[PDB]
RNA sequence: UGGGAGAGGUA
């Protein structure tokens, strides 16, 4: 809301990064990444890597 | 919880069948409660208890009185006497051999 | 726990309303802002 | 482990005790069986008493 | 210690008068930087929802305000948020919980570097909110008297 | 007749069909029916004291000046001095 | 009045099959709104009873299949304001 | 005894162990898929506690394996006081609960009982501050001693 | 994560 924007300006942020659900190679699978797609979404900014 | 209601990956819930015969049942009941109270015809009445009836024989036998009454993806619900009767049943797959 | 004998019959509607907790009077299961 | 209940307005036939067979209810009523679903099935009138 | 009832409604009473002052927008920029990297956060359209003072008092509120409370942008920036924009002090302890880094704490967790609670975010802001008083308070009958 | 049917949808087109459509002037006078019914219950429940006595009371509650004036009186400074 | 127009109803919810309710509700519950519609209709406006009947059996129609259809029941204000964003955006 | 920033890092780096222990428990409590998403709709306002890396965490169970393994008494309070996350009082408590009486020397003519809160609670302190400062140099030594994996290279 | 269908395959 504007009443914690004002107040971000006041002080700062948080981390709110508490739960991670990163992808993890299923266990016994190894082998080398030959390819990697980054599909995205009409409006949201993409990154370096894509 | 043993007539669960379980999600997919995908944000949408794939419920089972008892939510649905359990819903159609309670719907019927209280229209027929506010049929009762609305002092309806007697044609209009006795077509809401007849639905009751089978509503309620559906959710206790499916496929015993009459036409089945299907779901969504036009299958045939499973009712009580289809989960504990068959070969896909709760005696032959759960009780005698467990995982 | 420790039972001889695994006894079946017909339930009266006592029995039924002995078995129960509370008089289910809604279809709707949950709700959809917060899923209480 | 807990269970509800649902307060019926007309109270219902069980379909195990109807319908699979013999009936229990034309066995035991010494009613035909097409007579009593015609009764459920509210197309024709039975007299009590 | 704190201030007697009568002191406390006087200075609360002055201190909504200035809040509605600044509000509007109506300081000048260059008498003070604090309130001007605060009022740059608001749109310029604003209600007025208050009574308004005039100007020279305002003046003079402000220019006592920002000449004992120079030392420390924290506190006179609560005292902006809970008088100037009008927000409640529960909506500023609340995102004093939601941000404030973790702190040592006495007699409830035993030394656990640990978040405050909530309970402990509302004291420590109504400390700050009275402490800013009673450095407001005998400067500003010096500053009128 | 009354077979083996067990479709219940179908039974109530059974149970439907022995009524008739209603003509173009039919129902004009079944509804003066309805509202017969009505000026008839209305015209007897007119010459009940306490019940007179019950919308004089309850037209002193909304005078009062703590129920609306909505839950009472559909239509027909005016109702006032009329029940006055 | 009744028993005289539940062609009617069956006429109308003809077209609400397959919206994940049953054949029987729907007249059932257009029913219920013919009789509202018997209780509350007046004659000296020319129309003869369809024109005012068969909004009410619409309405009861749809807010039947508007609540008793899924499990997870979304109202109907919510579920035309998501249908206004979604023929907007 | 030690220093109090020394003392800030040894705590933090050892609640974060005993977070990291407290999360690999049998009996936990059971919550069902319904109140998973009434806590992923409206969460609760405290969260959960921090974990470690599960190298940290495996190299300061190693530390302690290698200091604490002779006493099992301070080794067991340390884990209800730094993973269960009860306080000193708690501890102190519980340990007066199941107290026995043992022959004291220091007040009186030597009477026998039932020893008190304020001597549990002395106890538990001096066994948890001796426990801290045995901990504290080897694990300082553990971790200079530790080399540091760096990002992936790419050769050509 | 868990549930239900449809298709294919192995013994």
New interface residues.
Partial sequence: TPEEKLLRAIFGEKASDVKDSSLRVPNGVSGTVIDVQVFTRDGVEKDKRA | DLRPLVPLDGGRFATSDLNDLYRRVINRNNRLKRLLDLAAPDIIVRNEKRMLQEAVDALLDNGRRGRAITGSNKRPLKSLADMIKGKQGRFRQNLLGKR | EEFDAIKIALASPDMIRSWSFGEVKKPETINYRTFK | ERMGHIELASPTAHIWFLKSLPSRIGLLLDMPLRDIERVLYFESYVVIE | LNLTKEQHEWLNGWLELWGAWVYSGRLEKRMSSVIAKFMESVEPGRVMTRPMCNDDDGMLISQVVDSVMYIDKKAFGILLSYYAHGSSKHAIASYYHRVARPRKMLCRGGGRIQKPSLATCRREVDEILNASLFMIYPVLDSAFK | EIGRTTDPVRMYMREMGTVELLTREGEIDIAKRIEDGINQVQCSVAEYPEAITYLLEQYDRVEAEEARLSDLITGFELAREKFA | ???????LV?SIAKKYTNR?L????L???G??GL?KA?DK?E?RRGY??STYATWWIRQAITRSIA??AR????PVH?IETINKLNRIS
């Fill in positions: 009045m009744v028993e005289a127009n539940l062609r069956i994940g049953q054949f029987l509700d007249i059932q519950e029913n219920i009789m018997v209709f004659y003869k009873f609540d008793q499990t997870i029941r979304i919510m």
